[model samples]
Each structure stands twice: as C-alpha cells, then as structure tokens.
Target chain A: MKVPEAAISRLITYLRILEELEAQGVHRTSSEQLGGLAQVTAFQVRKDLSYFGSYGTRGVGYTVPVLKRELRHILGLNRKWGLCIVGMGRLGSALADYPGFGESFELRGFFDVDPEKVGRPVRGGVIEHVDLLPQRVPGRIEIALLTVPREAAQKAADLLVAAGIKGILNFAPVVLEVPKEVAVENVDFLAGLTRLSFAILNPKWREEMMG
Target chain B: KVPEAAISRLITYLRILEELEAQGVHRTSSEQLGGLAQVTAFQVRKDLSYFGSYGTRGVGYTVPVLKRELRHILGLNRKWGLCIVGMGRLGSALADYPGFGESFELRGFFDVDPEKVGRPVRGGVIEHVDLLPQRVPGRIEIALLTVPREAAQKAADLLVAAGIKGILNFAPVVLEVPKEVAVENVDFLAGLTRLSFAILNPKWREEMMG
Candidate 1:
C-alpha cells in the first residue's frame, strides 16, 4: 500500500522517539506517549503505523525494541547506506563530519567543481572534481547530500543524476528538476524562516495581540 | 484566516517564484508553479486564493506581482533581526549562509562556552549564552537555534525569555515552547533518511514524480 508523505515523515519521528525510549531502558510505550514525544495525536500515530502493519498488542502497547526494529527495516535503516557530499563549502564540510551519519550511513566520497577545493581531504576522503563524477562515483553510493550554491545547484544536480545517484538531499534554496526515478528532498532554510514568519503574522496571533 | 498547511506551501511557492523572477521569468501558470513546487495546480491556485484573487483566469499569475504578494503575506517584505544561539559547526555554517536575503539580518551569535564567547563570527561577536537575555537587542524578533540535543531545551528557554517571537530550530529533538512563540524545526537527518527510504522503496516516489 502507498503511504502518505505525512505518514512517512511521522514514521521517521516515531523511529527517533523509539530509539530514545530504548536507550532509556523503556520496554513498552503506548501510541499516546509516542504521539506526545513526536508532537502528534495518538490517533494520528495509530493511523500512520497502520500503513505497515499492526504491531501493538491491545492493552500492552508497542514493545520498544520490536517497534524500533520494524521501523528500521521499514525505513531501510537496517543496513548502512553509502553517501557522498557535493559542494565542499562550509555546510558541506560540516555535514561531512557530522557524527550522526556514522552508524546508519557511510561517507563514501566528496565532489566539487572548484579547482582549489578539489583534491582536498575531508573526513578521510579526498574531494574529487565534479566533472569526473560520472566515471569516479562508486556504485556503492546510493545517495548524495547537495550543498552547492544556488547558481551551481542545477548543474551539480545534473552531474549527480548522470552519475547514477538515486536520491538527493538538496540544501540549495532552489527547486531541482530531475527524472521520475530519482528522489530529491529539498532542505530549504528559507521555508522554515517563512513558516516562523507566518506564525507571527497569522490572523489569530494578530487579533490576540490587538485585543 | 488560519490556512495552516496552505501557508507553508506559499513559502515554498514564493521561493520558486523568486528564483524564476531572478532568471527573468515574468509570468507563470498554476501548473508550471505547481510542477516546480511538487504540489497540484489546483492546490496552488487555492493557496494563492487564500491571500487574494490576483491572477487572471487564463493569463496565469504575473510572477513579480505574485512574489510581492507572497512576501507581504509571509511578512518577509519587512526587515527582521535574527540571532543565532549556537556557534558550533552547524550554527557557524548557518551564520555564514549567504541566502538569508535582504529581509533578514543576522544580529549576533550566542554560545555557552566561555572559549567561544568573545570570538568573531560571520555576522558579529559570539556573546556568552547566559547573557543572551540581557544582550539581545529589542529589534531582534527571530532566532535560529543549532544547539546540541541536550542543550536545546535550555537554549530555547533562554531565547523565549529573551523575547524572541519566532524560532528556526535545527536540533533533532522535539522542543516544548509556549503557544505564543512560533517554532519551525528543520531535521536534516530526517530529510536525508526520508530520501533514502524513497530510494529504497520506489513505490513512494510515484506521487512525487508526477
């Protein structure tokens, strides 16, 4: 069955919550508690989890380890994914060293167009010239984190696509146009900024302040 | 007045429109805009309608006009003073990010470590985190939080007490804040993992592909 985008997002949240629970030695948890931690309603939690299968025992709730294992399998996090970083800028460099990617993901390589940046070592991997991506990018690389500048974004994305990258996590503020088979997720900081702006400027807040 | 989901989409639409406008594109149809933003043409039209009727039935939307309207509605047309609450790698990169545009100004940086304090960053000097409440200028209304998971709540609490009206949080953990203050969380790991899932299971990619 096809899962809703929101459901997938919530599942990711649930996975994180379950990981925390397991770390704290919590054996079991109810949808209500999971929802509270994930900032969703219990009903919403149940609805999202139902897309996979019923893992909860009526009154016993969900077993933290069991649920976490199931979610890891569902999310394809059971195995390590080979990942690469494009654009050797400050953001890219920071992401290259980010410790969170240690267990579930591996930093296979780095790519950049700048002559000065190419061949520089970052996180135990040398940055390869982006022009050589099609030939040099290993088949093990399943996903790429795009941190290129806005003007260079589309061109860099095209290179990644041609190099057989199946998934992209784009940090550039521009929209990427790619093939149907390729998956692109945009991490637009401006979007978050504007959302905050909307919360402040929304009519309800305006009315409350005025009154 | 409370167009919750639609309001978020407008921000995305506005981003695409701005990029297009910069490329010299003067007009766009709902279909074209929707295609770029990963939303339906009908949904795009409905979202635009929530602000006001600005597009002609057949002529589509004038890019410049729609952009201006979106900026106005999102309150991005006015200047906003922004403060950064962490000076770590992520926070430092955000402080150095060049795309915040003309509307948002980086006011200062704050860190708990005395070693990091008094250091100069891209925007300004890094002040001691404890002094945030006293040092935050009155004009500062928005804050970008990039602290670690354990320190997130405390840093957020400080930002709240410092009279911040809105927050853009990058921490992975959930944050609890007052109802009056608006918080937007950006989970980079979640975004990456979501893409990984979509790639592993292509069935989930169909809707987005269209």
Candidate 2:
C-alpha cells in the first residue's frame, strides 16, 4: 500500500525523538510528548502512527526502545543501504566528511571522472573512474550520490542509468530529468538558498505571517 | 519587481546558463535556456528583463556573461556571515560543509548545553546562546538551526529576537518566526523515506508526476 510522504517524515521525526528519549533514560512516551517535540498535534501524532498499526496501550504511553525499533523497521533503517559518492568535488568531499549519516547507509564506492582522483586513497573507499561501474556495481552501490556540476548532471545521470542505478541523491543545482524507473531525490541547497531571497526581498511574506 | 516565481525561474535559468557555458555553448537563445528549465521562451525573456535585457535584439545571450549577471542579482557574488544553533552532531557536521564556497562564512556556533559552551569547534568556539544577543545583531545575517525539535522554536525565537535575517532549518519542527526573516528547511530523511517508498512502489513516480 502507498503511504503519505509527510507520514514517513513524521515517523523519522518521531524516531529521532525516541532515540533522544532512550538516551535520556526515558523508558516510555505518549503522543503528547512526541507531539511537543515534533510540533504537531497529539491527534496528528496518533493518526500518523495509526497508518502502520496501533503501538499504544490504553492509559499508558509507548515503550521508547520498542517504538524506536518499530519506527526503524517501518522506515527501513534496520537494513543497510549501500551508497556511493559519484563525484569528489569540494561539495562532494564535504558531504563525505559529514559524520552523521544513517548508520544503516554504508558508503561502498567512490567514482570520479578525474584521472588524478582515480585510485586516490580515501576514508570510505578509493576513487575509481565512471567506466568501472560495471565491475563494482554487481551486487553493490544501490544509490548514487550525484554531485557533479550543474551541466554535467544529466550525462552523469545517464551513466548511472546505464549501469542500472535505481536511486539517486541529486546535489546538483538544476532539476534532473530522470527515467520513470529511477527515483531522484534532490539535495538541492540552491532551492533553500533562494527561499531566503524572497523573504529578504519584501515584507509580503512576513506580513502574510505576522498579520 | 517580477513575481516570486520569476526569481525562482531566474535561479533555474542561471543553472541552465552555467551548464551551457560549461559545455562551451557560448551563446544561447531564450528558447534554448527556457526549454532546459521547462519554461516558455517568453517566460525566460520576461524573467531576465526584470534585471536588464542581457540579450540583444535578434540573438539570445552570452552564456558565461548571463550567468555572472544572474549571480549578482541573486546576491551570490558576495559572502554572507552565518551562524549555527545547537552545536550538536548535525550542527558540527554542517560547520565543516565546504559547499558554502566563497558565498557564506561560518561566524559562530551556539548551544544551550553548558558543557559544550566553551568547547572549540571548526570555525570558532561554541558560544552560549546568551552570547547571541551581543554578537549577532551587528553581523551574522543567517543561522543554521539544528537544535532539537522541541528546542527549535525557542532557538528560532532567539534568532528572531536578535535580528537575524535568514534561517536554514534542519530541525524537524516548523519554526514560528516573523515573515521578516526567511526560513528554509533541510529534511535529511525525506529522501530516504521517499526512496523506500519509491523502491517499494515501482509505479510511484508516474503517479507523482500527474
């Protein structure tokens, strides 16, 4: 069955709250606390969790550890997601340095078009050329993190498609035109950056909020 | 000024011009750029007209030159001072994010935890959020909000109260702030969950497009 993306987002948010709660030595929680943490209505929280199934006990809150496990299971965080960096540019390198990724998401391959970058020793894996995708992608590298330049994105995406990559995390500035079989989720920071432009441009946005 | 959608289209056009330039496509007609951005050719010309007509009467525009013009209009040619709230794991990771390039400089890191307040981080020491009042007003136009979900609103309030101009929120909560401040959200898990759904539902993308 299909589910709402917002519900999945909420599940992860709830998962984060549960993780923190478990670390804080809290053993149980109600929708109210989760709602407070997530800035949602308690009814909304209950409705969201209801999508999966009942996880609550009458007159009692959820067991933190159990709920965390369940959310992880529902979100597919329980299984490992093997991923690779498709570009080793400055932005790609910065993403490589980011320490907090889903522990379940494993970095397995690093690919680049640069001859110099090829075979360079890196933390997660050695850099390889795009041509070696067939050799390395047999049972590995399910997701490709596309960080190539804006113009090169489509060509790089074409390569990923040729190699049968089904999932892509697009960090390029432009919107990607992908095949229907492929799932393309953008990490488009440019969109976020432009959101600030309209806000800083006029009081129209603020007045809409403030008044 | 053009409508908000025009400015957004302008960003897309900029990217188009950037790629075109990289491909050594020195000159482009509005139709070419518009087609790449999925907009009408007239829309492209109309959007660029708000700033100035970069195109000549008969031809289109010079690729690299048009890109530089868009960069200036978007205010990306200069740097902006930025800060991050809640110097926890996420915030610490962002501090070292090199994508800021020549555009944004990390100015301060703030946290409510007393134990972390004096600790050193990438750009600077983790300052108490209390220090925000004195340090933020005169400078630091933007902040990256990575505070815990419950604390996010309070930290947002601190930014709104302290005269912050913009916020890039990574926390999972919607911040309550005056429209005077711009807020952008970065959902790190949206992609993962969407991927899960996509992998599970093979026909998902077709329906989504409709």
Candidate 3:
C-alpha cells in the first residue's frame, strides 16, 4: 500500500500493539480495540487497513495471527537485518540487554575503541573491537544504531559507511552525515526537551495552534 | 521564527547531508533530500525559506551552506542548557552522553530520590528535585525527562511548573501536555517496529511496480 508518511507512523503503533497481543497469547483483535490501543478511532483503523487490501472481515475486526503475519510480511520483518551498534558503554550495554533487537534483528556485534571492553564480555557477547568493524561487520550490516560520543559521531558514521551500513538510527545529538542510499534517523533528546518546554510554558498556545 | 517541526527535522537532514558531503557530494536536489527524510520536496523548500532560500535555480542547494544555516537557527551554534530529570542509570548515561549535549552542555542532573540527590553525575553534582522550582528557572532551559513511564507525567508537570520550557522525554508511553509543548517522542520500540514493517513490506518499491 502506498501509505502516507503519517499513516506509516501509525503503522508503527499498530505493530507494537500486535506484538503485545502476541505476547499475551491473544488470537484476534477488532479494529475497535486495536484503535483504542493505537490512540486512533476505529473508523480510522479500518480505513487505514483498507489501503492494504481489506484484510479485516466485515464482522470480525481482524485475525490477530493473520494480521500480525501480514503486517510483518508487508513491513519486511520476514528478512533478517544485520544491526551494528556503535559505542559499547553503559548505555550501549543496557541497549544490548534492553529486550529489544534480539529476534527480529540480529545484533551483528558492537563497535567501540575501549581496549578494556573490546575483548571483554558485555552481557553475554564479546564487545567486538571497533577497529575490526570495517573488516568484520561493515559490508553485511544494514542498520547502524549509533550511541557514540559527540566528538566521535562524524568519525563513527564515516567508519560505518566505509564498512557498508545502509541505515543509521543515531542516538547522538550532533548531526552526523551519511550517503543518499543510506538512511539516518536521529532521536534527539534535547530537541524533545525543547518542545516539551514550550508546551509547558504555553499550554494556551498549543490549544490555539491546534484550533 | 521557524516552526519547531521544521527546525527539529532540519537536524536530521543536516546529519544526512553531512554523510553525503563526506562522500564528496557538493549539492543535492530537494526531491532526493526529501525522499531520504520521508518528507515532500515542497515542504523541504518551504521549511528552508522560513530562514532564507539558499538553493540554486536549477542545480539545487549547496549542501554545506544550508547545513550551517540550519544548525544556527536550531540554536545548535550556541550551546544551551542541559539538565536531566531522573538520576537513574538512563539519567547517568545521558549525563555522560556524548551526543545528548553536543549542542548543549550537561549543566546538571536532578532527581527526587534521596540516595541519588547528593551524588555526582558525570562531573556535575546531582541536585534534589525540590531545587528545580528555583534553581532550574535561571540555570537551565532544556531538561531531559528520563523518569519512568509512570512518573513521566508528574515530573513533566513539575518541570513545567518550574520555569523550564524545553523537554526531551525518553519514557515509553505517550504523554499529554499543553499545545505549547512540542513533544517529539523517541520511542525506540516504535521506531524499530516501524522499520521492521517497512523492511517487510517495501511498499514504496511495490508502488513502482504497479
């Protein structure tokens, strides 16, 4: 389905709910219930699903197993993606064990320069040496989730590209560069902080702006 | 003033541009740039014009110049206030975070936890949450909301009650704040799931086939 960017974002929400349902061993869900969890109206959920070829039956909202499989199939989760996490520090270690990124995406390994952490076991795996990133992990790695220092961000990205990473989810606030073929998504803490600050300072502005 | 949405997104685009520039790319057409950021070319031009139009008539924009202007407008040129709300592992990681404060220095860390109140985070001292009402107003303008999901709303309420304005919430749940508050969520699971689905489907490429 040629969904809009807005819809694609909503799809992320729906997928998360589906994951939760699967975990709970729930077999099916109607658009009405999924809509509530996704923070959207049931009508909107049904309309969005229609874009993907009317997967939901008229009476039964959607079969959880079928919808989950279809969403995964449509989203490309069927393929295994090689993920490389840059910077193997405390935050990085926490991420390694964060209960995310194990099944759907394989952690190719971590890349960092800390000599002490390089060969040592973090969580369970040996923290892969940063120097070997290009030689060992780069060409095959598809996604790079960077959590490196600001000073080393640009260099870290450059190193990832040289090694052949296609998409990067940067945790650093510094704007790091990547190729046109490469996708870089940044989750900026400070920027979000700034927005929340504005919301707090001017609640009236928010309501007015929306109206 | 530039819209906050455009300003924040510019940070993402600038980083992308930097990568292209490193590969010796001197200029880029708006369409190509927009495609990477998943935004429209018209939106890209419009957003840039809020500051000033810097693109060439046909050849498109000079990558480096546009990047510098965006950084300046986003207040990235000058380091701003950096404060953390919770003094937990995530908070400490953020205090020591290399990227969290590149545009803003980590001024301090704050928490209501008594054990963590007097401790030091990075090189700065961790202050009590009570001090935020007075201490935060004059000292820091931006604060990172690292409190857990359950406590996120209240802590933000407290921060807003104080003079602080800008916040970056790392909590997992969706938060309701006044419209003036620009809540740009960083839900790691959300992003991961979206990408996972995108990779599974490749709808854009499929659209081409049809």
In terms of docking quality, model 2 is incorrect
lDDT of 3 at B148: 76
Docking quality level of the chain pair in candidate 3: incorrect
Q: Model 2, range B73-136, lDDT digits (tens) per residue?
A: 6767767788989877557756765567667778899998999899988868999999888889
Q: Put down candidate 1 lDDT per residue, B87-201, tens digits, no spaces.
A: 8877887887777988888887889889999999886899988887786658788999988788899899889888889889877667898978888876577777788788888
* DockQ (model 3, Cα): 0.20
Candidate 2's C-alpha runs over 4 A off are A1-4, A57-60, A190-211, B1-139, B143-189, B201-210
Of the candidates numbered 1 and 3, which has the greater DockQ value?
A: 1
- Colliding pairs, model 1: none
What is the Å distance of residue B72 in model 1 from its true position? 11
Model 3: residue B100 alpha-carbon error in angstroms: 7.9
Per-residue lDDT, model 1, residue A92, is: 88
What's the true lDDT of residue B50 in model 3? 51
Best by lDDT: 1
Error of 2 at A93 (Å): 1.4
DockQ score for model 1: 0.34
Residues B1-210 of candidate 3: C-alpha lDDT, one tens digit per residue = 114444456666777787778888888888877877767777677667754655675797888887777665555666567688887767888776555546566777899889888896677899988888877777777778877777989888888778766677777666676644555556575455555554444445323322
